[PDB]
Each structure stands twice: as structure tokens, then as C-alpha cells.
Structure 1
Amino acid sequence: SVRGLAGVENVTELKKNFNRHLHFTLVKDRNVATPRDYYFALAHTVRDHLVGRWIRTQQHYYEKDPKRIYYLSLEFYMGRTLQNTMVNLALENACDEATYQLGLDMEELEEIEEDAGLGNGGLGRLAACFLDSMATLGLAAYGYGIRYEFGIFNQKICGGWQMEEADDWLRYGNPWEKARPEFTLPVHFYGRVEHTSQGAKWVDTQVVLAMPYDTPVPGYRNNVVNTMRLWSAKAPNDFNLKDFNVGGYIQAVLDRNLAENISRVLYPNDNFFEGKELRLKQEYFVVAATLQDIIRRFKSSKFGCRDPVRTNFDAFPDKVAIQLNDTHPSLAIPELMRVLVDLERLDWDKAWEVTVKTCAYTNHTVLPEALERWPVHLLETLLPRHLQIIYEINQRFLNRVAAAFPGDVDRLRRMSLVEEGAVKRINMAHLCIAGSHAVNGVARIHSEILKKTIFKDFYELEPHKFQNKTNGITPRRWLVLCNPGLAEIIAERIGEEYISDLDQLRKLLSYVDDEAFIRDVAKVKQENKLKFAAYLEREYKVHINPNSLFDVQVKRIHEYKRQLLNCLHVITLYNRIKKEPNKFVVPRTVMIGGKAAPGYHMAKMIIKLITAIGDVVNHDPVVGDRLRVIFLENYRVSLAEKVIPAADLSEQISTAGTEASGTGNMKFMLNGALTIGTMDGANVEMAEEAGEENFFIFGMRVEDVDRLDQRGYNAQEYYDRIPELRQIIEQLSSGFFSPKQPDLFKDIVNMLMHHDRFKVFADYEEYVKCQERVSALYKNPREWTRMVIRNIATSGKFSSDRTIAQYAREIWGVEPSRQRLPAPDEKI
């Protein structure tokens, strides 16, 4: 496969270091070396191959002095690092022959690696895909976050319910990171502000130290390795013990855990806001340490050598660019204002110029409960200075508004960064639009929604700020790494230039009718389906049938994602088979997977429904092998990499206007699944790219949702209008699916009948008819595969290399470079 040269010298070379590392780093003999010992030797042999490129790339940005880009996210949902690194360095074939010879099987050692689940879902993964594309496109970019000890929990289902367990991921070591203690910085919390003369001073503050740990980010086959820098919380040695602090010695040593708890656990809330003080602590700590290291790289770099004026921040938006991944590092904006004004002694208006030309914000959702609005009291306590700076910024901003919109009092109170009434709060998205030069949305429809509805006031004051940069996925991890079959049969016809130039994929349109190509595309899918059906019984159990249509919905459990509509379809299909059980039905394995947040009760109740329908469906002897309903336990990056290559049908069913982009959708179109969905997020651009006919769009447009809300959504109407729907709601209310526990789902019933914000019933007729059309196509294998070929040949636009190339050019002001740097190292 397009997995590199498998030479003679290089297998000898790798066989030899895997062996030194077993002896020297693991200090073990062959006779007693553990599987994890084995994976650790190979993970160190592979990382010795990128060490010359990382040193060489970082010195070279120091020679060249490019405008550097800093992507700041409290989330980096990286997944495992070993295969991805061999892909990108073209080493996968030789690590596989070399381990083979040593008697090992590299795929069992890969599986021993633990996931970097430092992300929640969607925005988590996008930061990880961007990082890959920034290194590939040769950008001097840096990803910055929190090194969490505990990533997103691990989900266990027990009695049909989710069980969360500590993601203890650094338990056994991490070979991919490099700690850098010389770059440790202090983060101040609490204190007070004293106004002393040639400055407002932030005084008597608690200090918490930030320790960086660098991970390598290799670009695809180009000798560029950029850094992901993650900060850890560390208590200062002295102060936890010392002031005239009696409390007890052993307890003051043990209370240091309180200060180190800043980097301890990712908040597991996907698209939700919990105003926890510890969450505002994680947001200020990643920002404060990161701005310190930005300025260390600027003041030095070819500014500490030639240095004059009084060293100036005028050059700063031309040497630095920072990107805010949602509102979560919005503190960057008053923190850069604090440093420049309070510490560098800059003028307000000079420093506001520099901040806005440096900052840009990416809005990720439109769902109100996800929007961050912190209490002025939290800010008060924790960050005295930043609350003053936010009130001054507010102040001048709403004076630019008054001036442009005279007498329009309502507007002023609509634009206020501070929201009144009862628990005064600061709207962090208004802060980000104000202190930023570019606000973008992540799919052209979400970005219309913004300038039409939520930020229309902001757009009317400054239209010039509002952009769209449609999201993307990375062809490396999401095709070459998880589906090498498909990438080989594509490169066999059209070459390998496409993994770094994905619109090339359009050339597969000349083969849409090619008989050997139609047969390769379907085989690969049968093989990918056949591998995952096995793994399913080796790792868990049920027994699925690889000759079914694999119908999969995998994403976080939310009401707006409408996992309940796919559930209503599955009870409809079971009830149909039980009424006419001797008629042919195209058989299907329905897989639903995703994690609910701790205490999102409806979401946790929806996992209970899915496994309660599967207990019933999966043991009906009349249903036999026609319908299997499976919930996919502990869905993560490495699991998305096994089931997305085996999927036939992709459920993408949000109520229109709630899903800002989706990216799950793009991964499935790359890998050969057909999509069923609503005209929402990036599903609108995907269908436009594939052609509407090669797609299954159904249901309400964002237009119709609205027309229904103005009249008033009434579920009762659907219930007594459709008998198939009315039958399913009394099977739930009568205890058909919880037959010892009849009140069990009366909760799901009631919000459906009376409190549905997402209009599950209103799109049900249409979805069940559209799904009937899916199956009629599956019945004819040649036409299913030529539709599949027109979706795969058309996913070039959903590469993160286009997303990042558009970001670089119209927000960050830098040019991509496709070409090779000439690293690695030296035989000096």
C-alpha cells in the first residue's frame, strides 16, 4: 500500500533501534518484556525519526522570523499518536516489516497506546485536524492548551446505563511529550488593584506555576514538525507552606493539591456552560501562561538583536496572530490589554489597536445554553484587574455604537458586554467580537444565521469583521490512516498527490462507470465491514451480519442531534416486520454511539432507550437477522477510526439551524457512506458539492422551523395525525420496552409530547419515507456504489488544508507552503 518504501537497509535500521530501546530505555530482556514494554520501544524508535526535523523546524522559524500563529484551545482531541506519525513520515511499511521480523504484529502494539482524549467532540477534533494541516501547509503555528491528567471520561454501559470512569491517560507514561521546565511561568489569581501613580497595580495575588510539555506535530511528508505546548499546574514550593501559616506541615504539603487541580480534569460538557470557578481558572491559566510565552518569542526573536525605540509592540500584529477557538480563551483579550497597559506602560488606544489586529474569534454554535456568560462576582474575586478592563472596553465600545446609532437605546443594551438583572453577567461572545478583527462561523449557513440573527447588531456596526471558513477534516488520519484500502485503490487510478491536494479527488468522476473501479470501491467496503463485525465480537458481543446495511449515528448525545428521531425510525421498522413478518425487508445493523455528559439527564435517559430497544429487537425470533440495534460503547477518536470505514449510511439529522457545521458528516463522505440528513450545517455544502440527487436530504429547512415556531409547534397534531407515530408513543408509555419498570420512559414521552424544542415529530414522516428510499437503493449494489463514487470524488472541499489555507489568507495574513523543508538531522 501507499504506506512508503519498505527497503532492506531501513528495516535493519528500525529492527536495531527497537532492540536498543528494549535494552536501554525499557531496561528489559526479551524473555521478560511486556506488550506495553514492546509498544514503548517502537514508540521511541519512531519518535527518534522526527527529532531531527523538530529541532530543525524550530531553529528555522528562529532564523526566518515568520509571523507565528497561535491556536488556543482548551481542547485538543488528538487520539493516539503512533500510526499517524509513521504515516506522515512514510515509515508505516518499514515499522511493519521490521516488527514482523522481530516476531511482533504492529497492529496489536498500536492498540496498546492510550488516546489523547483532551477534547469533547467536535471543536476538540477540529483543533487536532487544524494542527495537522498547519504543519503540512508549512505554517509557523503553535497549538496551546492544558495538559489534563484526566481527559474525557471512559464510558461503560452497565444495565443499559452509562458509567463514567476516570480517563487516567498518563498512567504508564507518555513517550510523545517533552517537558520544558525552563519555560515555566507564573499565573496570578485573586489579589486586588491599587492605583499607584505610574500604574494600576494588581497586588497580593496567589501564584500558580505553569509547566509546559511539548508534543511534536509532523506535517505530511514535508520535514516540518511544529509544536503543541500544553501547560500543567504546579504549586509554588514556598507559599503553600509559607507565610506565618500554622494550619500543620503535613496538611500544607497536602493542600498543594488544591493548586495543582487547575490542570486535572477536562470539563465533559459538550456544548453546555457550567459557570464553575474551576472552569474560569482553566480559561485564565491557559491564557496567562500562553501570552507570556508569545511575548518571550517576540521580544527575543530578532527584536532582542536590534531592540530600540523602547522595544515595540507596533510590530506585534505583524509578527503574532492568535486564534480563539470559541469563547473559552476570551480572557486573552483583557489579558493582552493588562500586560500592555499595566506592565508595558502603553497608551490604551495604542494597545487596543494592537489587540484587535492580533485577535480573531471562531464561533462554534448558536444553541443559547452553550453560551458563556460569567457572573461579575466571579470576575471580581478571581480576576480584579480583568473586570476593570472589561468595563472600560464596554464603555468605549457602546460609545462607538451610540455614535453610529443615535438615540437607539435598545441597541446599546443589546450590545452591552455586561447583561443586567439579578446576577449581572459578562457575555463573553460580545467581548470576542469587540476586541477582535475577524469573527467567523464554521459553515456558510451558520455564518448566515449569525449575521441575520444573533450577531446582527454587531454585523451592522462592523460588517467587515464577519467571515465564514467552512470546516474540514484531514485526509491523513481520516482516510490514509483509518482506511488504507480505499486510499490504495484511489491512488492506483489517480496517483498519490491527493493526500496533500484533496480536490484532485474530482478525477474519480471519470471512473464512476468503470467496472473494475465500481468493484474495488465495493470490496474494500465489504472487507471494512467484515473487519469491524469481527472486532465487534472479539472486543464485545451480539453477533452482527456483514450483509446488512450498516446504519450509523456516532456523535455526542444531545437532544438537538436527534438521536430520538433515529430511535423512532427503528421502532417503526420493528413494528413493520412484526405485522408483515414474512415480507422481504432490506436488513440493517443500526449502530448508535456517543457519550452523554454527567447529569445531562435526558441524554443519559436516551442511552437507556437505545439499549432498551436493542434488548427487545435483538431477541425477537421473528425479526431474526434482519434488524440488530447496537449501542457503540465509549466512542472516541480511535473508535471513530474503525466504524467510519465500515459505515454504509450516515445519520446526520439535527433539527435545521442547531448544528453549526458538523465534521462527522465529512468523515463519512470521505469513507464511502451515503448521507441521510436535514439541510443543516455543512450538510448543505456537501449536497451542493455531490449534487442533491446523490444525497438523502429530507425534512424541514431552517425556513420551515421558523414558520412553525411563529404558528406554535404543536406535537399533539402529529401524534393524532400519524398512526405509526401514535403506536410508538403508547409502546413507550405502556412499558413495552421496560417491562418490569413501566414508568421508566414516561420522561422521554412527556418532553416529546409537551416540551420538544427540537421538533422530533415534525420531521418523522419525511425521514421514514426518505429512509425507505435509502433501502430501495441498497437493493441495487451497482447504483449504491456509483452514488458512493460521486460523494467520494467530491469531498476535496472538506479538507482542513482548504479551511487552513482560507484562514491563513483572509484572517491571519500568511501564505501556505506545500513544499519540503530539508530536515532531518546530521551525521556530523
Structure 2
Amino acid sequence: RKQISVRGLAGVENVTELKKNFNRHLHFTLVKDRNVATPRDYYFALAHTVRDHLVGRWIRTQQHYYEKDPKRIYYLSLEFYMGRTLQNTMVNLALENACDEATYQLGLDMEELEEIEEDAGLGNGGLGRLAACFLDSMATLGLAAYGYGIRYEFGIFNQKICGGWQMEEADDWLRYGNPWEKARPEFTLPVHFYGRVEHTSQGAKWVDTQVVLAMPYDTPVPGYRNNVVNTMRLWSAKAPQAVLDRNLAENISKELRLKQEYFVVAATLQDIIRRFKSSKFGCRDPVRTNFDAFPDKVAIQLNDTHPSLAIPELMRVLVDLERLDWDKAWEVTVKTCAYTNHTVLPEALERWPVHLLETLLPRHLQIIYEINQRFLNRVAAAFPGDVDRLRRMSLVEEGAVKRINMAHLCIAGSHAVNGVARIHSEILKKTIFKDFYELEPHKFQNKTNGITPRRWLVLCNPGLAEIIAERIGEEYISDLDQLRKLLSYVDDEAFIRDVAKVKQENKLKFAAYLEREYKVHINPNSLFDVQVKRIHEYKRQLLNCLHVITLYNRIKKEPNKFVVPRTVMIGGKAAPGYHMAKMIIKLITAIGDVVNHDPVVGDRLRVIFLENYRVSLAEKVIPAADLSEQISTAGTEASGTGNMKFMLNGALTIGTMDGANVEMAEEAGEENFFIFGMRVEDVDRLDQRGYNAQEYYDRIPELRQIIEQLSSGFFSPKQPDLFKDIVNMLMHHDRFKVFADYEEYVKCQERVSALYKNPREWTRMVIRNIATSGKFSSDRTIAQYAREIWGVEPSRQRLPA
């Protein structure tokens, strides 16, 4: 040792040693030939070549944290929607061009090579994506953060459309393993389920438990060019008839979800105290032990209630294991945890039945109770005589099924609870958790969501970032508010023509991709109208459907009257066993089989379902979008980060005054936004009076006609009654008010095409939107977390090399 260090091993980001290393990895790391390599072998080689550069920096970063002892942030989440690591590592590390030349010179095309990479199947959505944009911004802001979760071996399915219907296929992303991760067998910890608590004169004892082993995997996450590489640590379940218990064990990768919830917590928290106590540089020993500075050195950001078992667990470790006195343990737990809510919908909260916590984890139920009692006593002091307040506030819900309300726990156990959007965080204070806000207002906060400008602009849209940068430099990639500078070119004929050029190139490129994959020919001069969201009824892909049959039926009625051409691309996954979602994907495809095959349509309309929407494909479709469809019923959407992604990339939005749309439009100015339909005040008035959809049917002929086609097999001649289910629901069981927003939607849509007809004024409104999107960067959300909740100062400073 001593003479063993990173000392100068990666060499240079220079094309000659970068080609050496590609060959070194093809032959010695993959034990492969030129005679036996395939595209994948060649991708792993390039992946391992960039990975040496990333790992050298990771090591100099982690070390640096132990030397300086920063406050460590553990961001705890049950999904992280990472996507593909290679180009993001190369972009973030300024390696993408030397790798491009190196690869050219060995006779390979990095574009083809990057596409053999599988998306890390570690998340299914917005929650997980937020956590992933947060990991990029925490590293670019130089914070010492960690993302801890579960390493799902087969994530949630990969979608395949067959016969226009959805199929789910196993997401076997780890089939040939994953180069970005290092498995750490030597740090497997054990987790305890079941057991019984015997008490002693000394403490509570959780005896006779079944043990699952939690094995760690590490993957670095690069900050953008600041030489900071931080850590993602994902836990894998391993078994230590026994056949059956072993399988149940491995299933962590109903009760299984409470298991994996405890698993990621128990295991992560052992690491948090392990690294706490063993504070010194060089020294692997416990050195620290007074937990008084523990709030000063550890932050646990609970992403949603899914890891709320961290609060009963941290009290249990400190009180039983470390034998601290309960009031101090709690002093330290509230000063350490914080909770992030993501919903407007009370019904949606996480409530685990006590009969199950009784079985799976007796000790934690005991601590949820001494928390609850000591809580309700404080509310009691503060609002004496208010018996129903005790009732509403109680962590334990009651009657019918006896339940623990994990949100109430998270608010009791944390020193900051925040919503994700201005109106949303108001709803938390005012109606959702009003009694927690009257008891303790100081903890409620708002941290509006953001997206990372690296993955969502300089990576996926090099062209746009390239034309912006020549005018205002590159300081905006770490300070997105500098995009307000582009307003100085809303009249520059050269910047207008360029902004427009970038989008036509991006559309041509996307058309090329769909052509070679799904083999469709779409017209790159049409308006690309994109709706990509989880296929769900409040998302109202069905309003978008009624609109494309309005367009088809319209071209048909006057086939020689001009129309701006559109390509309507809808994409997204349907929950297996959500029947209406399944029916909607099948309608989109049925509509499209008619539309795209009609020759009187010519090249004026095409409805295309984008299969297997995932982070990789969003990176293709959003740089090519001309219109963002953000049409969910007012009041159902708390945020909308995809929304912000489309605005960053030059599409214009058509949507409801809701979620992300409201702060996007105050930033953009509402005259640069196609806001339509009923606001929240209007849906509630309609709810006060009862929606009766027959009134819309009765007074709107074009809608009456569309339902008439749906009931007669126009879009399913081979099986006429197929769509009866959506027809009856739209007519009689439509909670999301589709008919009530149609007329307005089509009128707004007409305005969209009118603007599209005059390319200089569309491009000028698109400049007004790009220039005001600077607010929606996740670096701004993370500098607000850092300062208002975690109590650390973001740094834009470079670490050495």
C-alpha cells in the first residue's frame, strides 16, 4: 500500500489511449475476439472504457467526502428511472467526442453501439424520474448525496403491442449483466422479518426473526463536468420447504410491498449509521459515537411515504440497539427525516393494515404506537377538548379494517414536509393535511419540481444546445435561468431560422428511427402532436382520440380543403389488468389502422402509438415534438415534469390550467400557452350540480357522430361491439369529464394549426417558451432543498481530476 493509488492511471481523454483501452477491454475484460465480437461485445468494450474514467473520479470524490466530513444526504426512493448510462456518462464527463472519433477510427459507429444498451429497469415513472434528475443535480451542485433503493432484476415489464393490443414481456435488462455497477458481496447486511418482541429489564428484544440478506450494488453518478462522481446503492435480496421460503425471499428482487419497503430502509440505515460512526480519513474504525451531531451530519429525504418505515426503524436502532433515551432518539429522528408528498388525492395515500405490521414487524408497530400516543398528547395540549382532532390526526385510522396512515406518521416524524408545486403545496396546507398545518405550520414547504438540463437538453438535443450556446455561452447548462437571455433574439431572423432548423432536423431523425424500427412512413413536415403519459382515464388520451376522429372525419367531409398536416403520436404503458387502459391503447391503434390506410387522407394525418415508452424513447420523441398534450382534468395533476421537458425542447403546450402548466404559463406568459377548457373552479361547480354527459351529446353533432362510429364498428368492422365499454363510460360513468371539455379542446386545436401555418410566429412563440423555461431545472429544485431543508450549501466548484 502507500505506493498504491489512482495516481495517474486513466491517462487522458485523448483518442489514442482511448482506442488502446477499447482494445484492452475487448480482449482482456470481455475475453473476446474481433472474430467473435458482435455489436454488444463492442458496446461493452466502449462502456468499460468510459467506466474507467468515471470510476477514477468516483474514488477521488468519496475519499474527499471522508476527508472533509460533509453532511451526507441519503435520498431514499423505491424507484429511480435512470435510463441509459453511456452517453449520459460521456456527455457529463466531456468524453462524447473523443469516444466518437476513437470509435470511428476502429470502424465502429457509436450511435449503433449506444443503442444496444438497455435502460436500467429501476423505475416505472415520474417519481423515479424525479429521483434520477435529482441525482444529476446533487452531483452537479457538489452535494455528498446517495440514492438508495432496490436493484430490481427484471424491472416492471417491457411493452409489446400485438394485434393492436398490449402484451407485457419480462424486462430482462440484466441478461448479459450491467457494466456500470460493482457488486459488493463483501457488504451484504441482514434484514429481519417476523419474530416476536420479548422485553427485558434492559430493553425490547426482537427475537426469533427470519433473515433475508441484502447485497449492495454501486453505480457512480456524474456531476456535469465538476469532477464529482456521487453514489447510487441498490440492494438485492438473497436467501441465507426452505425452497419456498427462499423463493419468497428472493422475490423482493400486498405483503411483498411492505417487505421491500422494510428491506431498503433497514439495510440503508445500517449503512447510514455505519459510515456515521466511522468518520475519519484512513480509519475504518468507529471513531464517532455521540449521536448529537447526527442531524448535523445525516439527511434522509423520504421520496414519498414508500420509505416511511425509516422513521420507526431509526428510532428502533437508536433506542434498542444504541440504547439512547427515547426523547433524544426522537430529537434526532425529526431533526433527521423530511417527507416529500406527490399527490392531491387523499384517497391515494399509503395505509398499511395493523394486523399485518403485527405479523411482519411487531417492534415497529410498537414504536408507531408510542409515536402516535406522544403525538396525540401534543395535539391535545394544543387543542384541548378537541376530540375529533385527536381522531383525524391519529396515525392509526379506524373501523372496518384497522390501519396505519403512513403519511400522518411521516408528518409526525419529519421536520419538513413539502409538496411539489405551488398550488399543490397549498392544497397540503389547506385541505389535505390542514390539522397538521394548524398544529405545526413551520414544517410545510413547497419545492416545485424540476428536470435535469443535461439529460433533457444537451444530451438529447445537441443541436438546440449548440445554437443557444453560440449566443449566450455555455454557463446556462449549470445555470438554466440564463435562457431568459434568448428573448433578445425573438426578432432575430437568423436565430428564428436556426431554432426552426433544429426542430426539422430532429423530426427527420425521429421519422428515420420509426421507419427502421416499426416500419412506418410519416411525413416530417407535419405538426408532431405528442401525448406520452401513463395510459390512464384522468390522463384523458380519450379526449385526444375524439379530436383525431374530428380531424379524420373533417378531411373526409371536404378532402380538397387545406389542413395543416399532423402526426399524432400517443405513447405510454397500461397497467396490466386495468381494463379501460387496455381498451384505450387498442382504440388508438384501431383509429390509426383506419386513418393511416385511407388514401383520401393522403399524407395529412397519421395516428401512431409509440411502443414501450421509456426514458430512451422520451429522449428521441421530445426533441422532435411540436405540441405537448397536457390535457388531464383540472385538479387531478400535481405536477408534470414531461411538460417541462417538452417546453425545454421547443414544443408548444396545449393543456388545462393545472399541475406544471400553471407555473409554466406564469413563467412563459399565458399568451404563449394554449390553455383550454374548464379550470378547477369549473369542475367543482359541475360536481356541485352533477355532470350529465347526455347534455353534451345532445347539443354537439360532431361528438354525436364520433360516438355513432364507435358504437357501429367503424373502427372495428371485423368485431363491431368491441368499443361499447368506452362508449357507455363516456356517456354514463365519466368521472373525468371528457365531453365537457371537447368543444373547447377542438376550438383551441384550431388555434394551434392556425399558428402552425405561419412558421415565423410559431418559432417566435417557441423562443418565448424556451427562454422562460429556466425555472424548471432540477438544479434550482435541489439548491432549494439543500438550503431550506437539508441545510447545506450547493457548490458549483470543480474537484481536481
Shorter-chain-normalised TM-score: which range? over 0.9
Q: Structure 1's 300 and 8: CA in aligned 2 closer, same or farther, altered over 3 A?
A: closer
- Larger deviation, residues 706-715 vs 333-342: 706-715
Between the aligned partners of 2:152 and 2:373, the Cα distance in structure 1 is: 37
Query: Residue 750 in 1 paired to residue 761 in 2?
Result: no
Between the aligned partners of 2:345 and 2:585, the Cα distance in structure 1 is: 22
Contact 1:3 1:87 in 2 (8 A): no
Q: CA deviation at 1:411?
A: 2.3
Between the aligned partners of 1:315 and 1:92, the Cα distance in structure 2 is: 42
Q: Structure 1's 102 and 316: CA in aligned 2 closer, same or farther, altered over 3 A?
A: same
Q: Structure 1's 181 and 664: CA in aligned 2 closer, same or farther, altered over 3 A?
A: same
Q: CA deviation at 1:714?
A: 2.0
Between the aligned partners of 1:111 and 1:633, the Cα distance in structure 2 is: 16
Between the aligned partners of 1:306 and 1:545, the Cα distance in structure 2 is: 62
- Larger deviation, residues 751-760 vs 782-791: 751-760
Between the aligned partners of 1:707 and 1:79, the Cα distance in structure 2 is: 42
Contact 1:2 1:488 in 2 (8 A): no
Q: CA deviation at 1:403?
A: 2.1
Query: Residue 12 of structure 2 aligns with which residue?
Result: 8
- Larger deviation, residues 321-330 vs 305-314: 305-314
Query: Residue 259 of structure 1 aligns with which residue?
Result: 249
Q: Structure 1's 767 and 5: CA in aligned 2 closer, same or farther, altered over 3 A?
A: farther
Q: CA deviation at 1:597?
A: 0.9
Q: Deviations over 1:736-790 (max 9, x none)?
A: 2222322211111222222222111211111111111000000000000000011
Secondary structure of residue in 1 paired with 2:168: strand
Between the aligned partners of 2:9 and 2:104, the Cα distance in structure 1 is: 16
How is 1:287-366 mapped onto 2 (pairs within 5 angstroms)?
Answer: 287-302=265-280, 311-366=289-344
Q: CA deviation at 1:630?
A: 0.5
How is 1:634-649 mapped onto 2 (pairs within 5 angstroms)?
Answer: 634-649=612-627
Query: Residue 235 in 1 paired to residue 225 in 2?
Result: no
Q: CA deviation at 1:561?
A: 1.1
Contact 1:73 1:325 in 2 (8 A): yes
Contact 1:588 1:626 in 2 (8 A): yes
Secondary structure of residue in 1 paired with 2:623: coil
Between the aligned partners of 2:198 and 2:47, the Cα distance in structure 1 is: 52
- Larger deviation, residues 176-185 vs 729-738: 729-738
Contact 1:6 1:94 in 2 (8 A): no
Q: Deviations over 1:409-435 (max 9, x none)?
A: 222222121121211111111111111
Between the aligned partners of 1:253 and 1:600, the Cα distance in structure 2 is: 33
Q: Deviations over 1:28-78 (max 9, x none)?
A: 222221111101111011011122211111011001000000000010100
Q: Deviations over 1:248-288 (max 9, x none)?
A: xxx6467533311112xxxxxxxxxxxx1111111000000
Q: CA deviation at 1:195?
A: 1.2
Contact 1:189 1:205 in 2 (8 A): yes
Q: Deviations over 1:445-481 (max 9, x none)?
A: 1111222221111111111111111111111111111
Q: Structure 1's 374 and 6: CA in aligned 2 closer, same or farther, altered over 3 A?
A: closer
Secondary structure of residue in 2 paired with 1:78: coil
Q: Structure 1's 742 and 413: CA in aligned 2 closer, same or farther, altered over 3 A?
A: farther
Secondary structure of residue in 2 paired with 1:53: helix
Contact 2:276 2:288 in 1 (8 A): no
Secondary structure of residue in 2 paired with 1:165: strand
Q: CA deviation at 1:4?
A: 21
Between the aligned partners of 1:624 and 1:252, the Cα distance in structure 2 is: 64
Q: Structure 1's 197 and 4: CA in aligned 2 closer, same or farther, altered over 3 A?
A: closer
Secondary structure of residue in 2 paired with 1:793: helix
Q: Deviations over 1:352-372 (max 9, x none)?
A: 111111111111122345321
Between the aligned partners of 2:309 and 2:6, the Cα distance in structure 1 is: 45
Secondary structure of residue in 2 paired with 1:4: coil
- Larger deviation, residues 544-553 vs 28-37: 28-37
Secondary structure of residue in 1 paired with 2:364: helix
Contact 2:151 2:236 in 1 (8 A): yes
Query: Residue 691 in 1 paired to residue 669 in 2?
Result: yes
Count of paired positions: 797
Q: CA deviation at 1:6?
A: 17
Q: Deviations over 1:112-134 (max 9, x none)?
A: 11111211110111111000000
Q: Structure 1's 369 and 153: CA in aligned 2 closer, same or farther, altered over 3 A?
A: farther
Structure with bigger RCO (C-alpha 8 Å, 6+ apart): 1
Contact 1:193 1:203 in 2 (8 A): yes
Contact 2:165 2:586 in 1 (8 A): yes
Query: Residue 486 in 1 paired to residue 464 in 2?
Result: yes
Contact 2:346 2:432 in 1 (8 A): no
Between the aligned partners of 1:470 and 1:675, the Cα distance in structure 2 is: 19
Q: CA deviation at 1:619?
A: 1.6
Between the aligned partners of 2:718 and 2:188, the Cα distance in structure 1 is: 58
Q: Deviations over 1:183-230 (max 9, x none)?
A: 211100001111111111111000001110100111000110000000
Secondary structure of residue in 1 paired with 2:544: helix
Query: Residue 388 of structure 2 aligns with which residue?
Result: 410
Query: Residue 186 in 1 paired to residue 190 in 2?
Result: yes
Between the aligned partners of 1:196 and 1:755, the Cα distance in structure 2 is: 58
Q: Structure 1's 96 and 306: CA in aligned 2 closer, same or farther, altered over 3 A?
A: closer
Query: Residue 773 of structure 1 aligns with which residue?
Result: 751
Q: CA deviation at 1:734?
A: 2.4
Between the aligned partners of 1:298 and 1:701, the Cα distance in structure 2 is: 49
Q: Deviations over 1:156-195 (max 9, x none)?
A: 0011111000001111011100112232111000011111
Q: CA deviation at 1:582?
A: 2.1
Secondary structure of residue in 1 paired with 2:698: helix
- Larger deviation, residues 518-527 vs 21-30: 21-30
Query: Residue 427 of structure 2 aligns with which residue?
Result: 449
Between the aligned partners of 1:28 and 1:373, the Cα distance in structure 2 is: 52
Q: Structure 1's 504 and 790: CA in aligned 2 closer, same or farther, altered over 3 A?
A: same
Q: CA deviation at 1:575?
A: 1.5
Q: Structure 1's 10 and 707: CA in aligned 2 closer, same or farther, altered over 3 A?
A: same
- Larger deviation, residues 728-737 vs 482-491: 728-737
Query: Residue 54 of structure 1 aligns with which residue?
Result: 58
Q: CA deviation at 1:792?
A: 0.7
Between the aligned partners of 1:79 and 1:754, the Cα distance in structure 2 is: 40
Q: CA deviation at 1:808?
A: 0.3
Secondary structure of residue in 2 paired with 1:582: coil
Contact 1:303 1:311 in 2 (8 A): no
Q: CA deviation at 1:541?
A: 2.1
- Larger deviation, residues 626-635 vs 403-412: 403-412
Consecutive unaligned residues in structure 1, runs of 5 or more: 237-250, 264-275, 824-828
Between the aligned partners of 2:725 and 2:399, the Cα distance in structure 1 is: 32
Query: Residue 510 in 1 paired to residue 483 in 2?
Result: no
How is 1:194-213 mapped onto 2 (pairs within 5 angstroms)?
Answer: 194-213=198-217
- Larger deviation, residues 726-735 vs 49-58: 726-735
Q: CA deviation at 1:548?
A: 0.5
Between the aligned partners of 1:43 and 1:671, the Cα distance in structure 2 is: 28
Secondary structure of residue in 1 paired with 2:220: strand
Secondary structure of residue in 2 paired with 1:565: helix
Between the aligned partners of 1:198 and 1:303, the Cα distance in structure 2 is: 35
- Larger deviation, residues 643-652 vs 732-741: 732-741
Q: CA deviation at 1:310?
A: 9.4
Secondary structure of residue in 2 paired with 1:32: coil
Query: Residue 129 of structure 1 aligns with which residue?
Result: 133
Q: CA deviation at 1:334?
A: 0.5
Between the aligned partners of 2:522 and 2:6, the Cα distance in structure 1 is: 31
How is 1:108-187 mapped onto 2 (pairs within 5 angstroms)?
Answer: 108-187=112-191
Between the aligned partners of 2:408 and 2:580, the Cα distance in structure 1 is: 30
Contact 2:66 2:281 in 1 (8 A): no
Contact 1:6 1:93 in 2 (8 A): no
Query: Residue 270 of structure 1 aligns with which residue?
Result: none
Q: CA deviation at 1:394?
A: 1.4
Consecutive unaligned residues in structure 2, runs of 5 or more: none
